[PDB]
Amino acid sequence: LHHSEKKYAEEDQVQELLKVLNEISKTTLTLDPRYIWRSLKDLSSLRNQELLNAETLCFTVNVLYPDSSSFKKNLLKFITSNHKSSVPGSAELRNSYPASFYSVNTEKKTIEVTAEINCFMHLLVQLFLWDSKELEQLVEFNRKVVIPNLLCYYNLRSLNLINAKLWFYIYLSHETLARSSEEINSDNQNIILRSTMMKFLKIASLKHDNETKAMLINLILRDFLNNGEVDSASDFISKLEYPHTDVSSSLEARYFFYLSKINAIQLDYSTANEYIIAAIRKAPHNSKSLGFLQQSNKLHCCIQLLMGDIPELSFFHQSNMQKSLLPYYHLTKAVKLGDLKKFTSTITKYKQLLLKDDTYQLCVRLRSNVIKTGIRIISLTYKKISLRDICLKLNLDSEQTVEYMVSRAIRDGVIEAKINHEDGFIETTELLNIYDSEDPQQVFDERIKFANQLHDEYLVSMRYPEDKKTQQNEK
Amino acid sequence: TTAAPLLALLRENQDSVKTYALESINNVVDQLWSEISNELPDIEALYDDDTFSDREMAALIASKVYYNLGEYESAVKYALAAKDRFDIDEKSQFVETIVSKSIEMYVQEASKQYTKDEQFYTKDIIDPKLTSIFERMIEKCLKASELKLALGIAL
Amino acid sequence: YFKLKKLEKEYELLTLQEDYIKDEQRHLKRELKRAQEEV
């Protein structure tokens, strides 16, 4: 029964391993193994549940084990395994073949098979851990082994993509351990993890690997959010080492998502407004990306309300995610109408929900934005309005209070008006008629730059796949 | 973890404090180099101080400012004042780069000055700090019994 | 050391073929003017 179960799943794993083995042996092609590894994550997730854990036991028996002798026993010890007589030395798939990792040349140590085996061995370990959700000692045991192994290898062009996806599981397993249970050992454990990120990033800077650095930057910027250091994030993004060429679309959306939250504390939303919009256009619409589209839209509504301008109202109802976007609608309504008591009761009921996404602090600063937006609304209605006429609307305190809040709104060039105290009314200095100025000419220059930007990229993207069809023989 | 506590002790005058503040930066590098760039002009100012005897260890860390920043042109220049503090056989990530980077700087200053004189390596025309490191890698290749790397780098 | 310097010469051979095609594509438009107008 259990004998035929191990031969079926292992043959499918070797069949996929032999495909990428001959691709890296001929010259240098870095895109051939990458296409299979994308589907390998989905195929292995469903395959690990079937036939239990016995598919990876004989895989260690097949290939020679440099480090893996005691790693499979410690993984099966936590589950209190039963002895099926799976002891190595029974199932042999090698049988002295060149593609089978011939044993005699391997045992004599005249050839090195460890490069394409041991590096691939760590990949299958992290896949089974994410399915069973194992924590505590099993997380630290794997992280301690991989770090010296990566420093011993030279990290060739094809070797940089093997561990590129392993860093995502290292950071994920460490964060889920701290949120589940907090202790004093978890704090000092992250200290070593912060040093390991910078040591490997410096090595990958020489190879200029596009996918490797794309995964690191996403994990490094996210670690600064929990650590709470802006100087580490500000100096990191100043180098601009992130390639835009071969990185995946899912990795691009995560990059622009961090720049929106970093620039949000600098009180400059001009650049941050583009990063949050570009992150949505680069994020897939599938179900696996719904978690990112949910968090990205929550930040988009908060950026516009902090700019003094009301965002698009139809964005809530047209989308199907508005169930979680309902609290943000009451925030926009309270700022636009200008009611002081409505804003206090708005954030009170949802105060518990605003703590998870850490957007409650941005909601506290909306208290002043209620008046900032209310002044712009009443200014467009009345070009010349008296001093006591505004207090009768928003129910402000005194007449001197409303007079000094308008002078602050013109600091950034929002209202663009003047206050005449001798006459007793506030007059708007904006006559429009900007068609006679040079201001629209500056915006029109960027539209030509944006049009010709995609023209050069059009020749690069379309012509590249036609290179292989010329050399290949056709009928 | 910030570099502010360790770099703030260099603003006073003490023999023991300036020693402990610099040695703590050599231990933790990859974490603290983010804030050192702002204090870079204050650290390099101690190199011209004659009463400051740690400039050998200070220039080793000052070279790591641009080395961790990604600029290898200035990383090799400040690493030449370490003298005995500059490791050779450590074979670390910092050693396998600056030494190899000094080889490229040794070639650029060679072919350009080879037209005027071929003896520049003997005279002071070329920085002897680069020549001394260049000769250490020659003896390292002789121990490996390889004549291609030893004789090929001198061509 | 011998095989390391062989890769440096291969980069120049790719540059010789790259710089010529970039110059040829602009000169082909001059031959098209002498072609469609003459025939």
Binding site: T470 | - | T15, Q17, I21
Partner: peptide, 28 residues
Amino acid sequence: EQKIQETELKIRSKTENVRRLEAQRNAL
């Protein structure tokens, strides 16, 4: 081999431009 690794990226981008501009030149 530090100098080779810095120029290692030139084996592809320079090869692509020769192949990309081939049919583009052959079209004219």
